Design a protein around this ligand. Structure first.
Ligand SMILES: c1cnc(N[C@H]2CCCCNC2)nc1
Length: 149
């Protein structure tokens, strides 16, 4: 799969993360990210996509060693960790045809898994509007614990 790059932007308290809401197949909340172009460096793709989806330019803040990367059905998603972005930053998605909304979410309030349907004797997972973000939540929490204590 074509790899994707983007960012986990946190505020000054490290409590909150910036999520974006897409449309249609991507109707729920996820991290800002997108597909690398031919001959584009990972960090450049992350800045370009995040600027398209948030209106915020991370280029000067990216630490090239600080990221969470997951393989999800043989597509790599790498999200560069960007702490310390003020909560009052004015975000303005560029791609309004793809981005419904942009908001800060409390890390401790986000799910790190979806719930089963064992109460209904039914297989599978209940819908959750954070499904795109969820796989990154436990890895983020662990990464923060280590880097900040
Ligand atoms: C898996 C799939 N997509 C995502 N994030 C997308 C969030 C919604 C806006 C469109 N582009 C980024 N995260 C994990």
């Amino acid at each position: 799969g074509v790899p994707t790059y983007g960012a986990i932007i946190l505020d000054e308290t490290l409590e909150n993360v910036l999520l974006v809401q897409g449309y249609l197949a991507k109707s729920g909340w996820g991290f800002p990210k997108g597909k690398v172009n031919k001959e584009e460096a990972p960090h450049d793709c992350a800045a370009r996509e995040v600027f398209e989806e948030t209106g915020f330019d991370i280029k000067d803040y990216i630490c090239k060693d600080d990221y969470i990367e997951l393989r999800i059905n043989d597509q790599l998603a790498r999200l560069y960790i960007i702490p310390g972005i003020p909560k009052d930053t004015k975000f303005n998605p560029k791609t309004r045809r793809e981005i419904r909304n942009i908001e800060w979410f409390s890390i401790e309030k986000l799910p790190c898994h979806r719930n089963d349907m064992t109460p209904k004797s039914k297989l599978g997972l209940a819908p959750n509007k954070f499904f795109m973000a969820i796989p990154f939540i436990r890895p983020l929490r662990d990464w923060l614990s280590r880097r900040f204590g």
